[PDB]
């Protein structure tokens, strides 16, 4: 793309592209060696009978940074490759390539840290294909729309008004398969405040659009679906993973949704106790190469 009135602050670029303002986080790179070592350890702990998958995905700057900013942004692909190369008996899912094929579509937000749910769908699709439980067509889902979404880029750009003045449209999708969600604390105790609440879609004001998916991160969510195929998935994620969850409901009998930052148990025992068959680690590059990955060691792998 071609850019106009580009300004950098706080590691972000605010720039106009084809008449719309974007906030894009610039990337510095990283080998992800710690992350890969932690995943490898997790896999050793759960053993051969549990398939462990890795899907590290880029942020928008991998695809949409305009011409002339190459010197300010490292390759997301290179970090994703480095991680893949260091994995041992963990199945790598090429989410990067899946997204790259759909960049003409509205797969990323302009004003938020996260992809749009459409982007998450393509990544979920890549995983589900590898896992041999492919997703249904997006036309089978009920489409919902939130207008006037100004995401995290407003704060991250130190409240640049250009971001607030060019909101996204946030489009999400409700799957066709019946399910029931149960909300738990981070030590997997049923959360008594939410005993009667069983949807993964939570009503939010427009600013909270991304929090439509399970309301936030400091919890564990168990999802039981009408697809009784014996496949039981545990997802260990950062906030990018939140938007993938709706796209797994059609494909798995049970889904456990856990955040690597907020987990107060020993993950290998959690897998064993709940009969988990498949584990997905999914997060953006910044999380996998940075401090968030340490949550795998400090939270998931701590007894």
From TrEMBL:
It comes from the Bacteria. Coiled coil: none annotated. Keywords: Signal. This is AlgX/AlgJ SGNH hydrolase-like domain-containing protein.
